[PDB]
Amino acid sequence: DKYLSLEEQSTAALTSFTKEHFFEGMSKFVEGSDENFQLVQLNVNSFGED
Amino acid sequence: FLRSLHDDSISSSVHPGKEDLRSLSHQQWMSMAEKVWNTHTPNHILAALERLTLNSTQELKKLQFSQAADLSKGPSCQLKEFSEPITQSRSCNESTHLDPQET
Known part of the structure; x- marks a missing residue:
């Protein structure tokens, strides 16, 4: 159990990494929404001012 | 061993001779793994x-x-x-000569 929990933490850490570096703008919105983690369809389009 | 399987899958060059080496490597791992389980406590x-x-x-x-x-x-x-x-x-x-990385 203890081992599997540590692995979960490791997986969580890996997940945070993948979000920040592959999915550019999301740090601001991580705080509030508790519940249903639905895989928000990351519309790529917005960034480029240009 | 896993990494080698991964590299082979990405480089499409299915070199037909690399299977016998894979098995030996698995067996070697099994033996070693077993030794570890016999030498140390779970x-x-x-x-x-x-x-x-x-x-x-x-x-x-x-x-x-x-x-x-x-x-x-x-x-x-x-x-x-x-x-x-x-x-x-x-x-x-x-090595890192490259950073001309001028913007």
Whole structure:
């Protein structure tokens, strides 16, 4: 159990990494929404001012 | 062993001779694995695995912090000349001439 929990933490850490570096703008919105983690369809389009 | 299987899958060059070496490598792992399970107590082996898992998470966090800093690192910063040559340490890959990376 203890081992599997540590692995979960490791997986969580890996997940945070993948979000920040592959999915550019999301740090601001991580705080509030508790519940249903639905895989928000990351519309790529917005960034480029240009 | 797993990495070798991964590299082979990406490089489409199915070189037809690499299977016999794979098996030997699996067997070698099994034997070694068995020896480990016979030489050490299961609680010790599990503890060792927990520790190894801590290290991986730590390394991932360090990379993120450095990598995230790189994203937040854009060029005003002046070439500070710091001195000391120890050994070489040209680059993690081995060499780094390239950074003309002018914007």
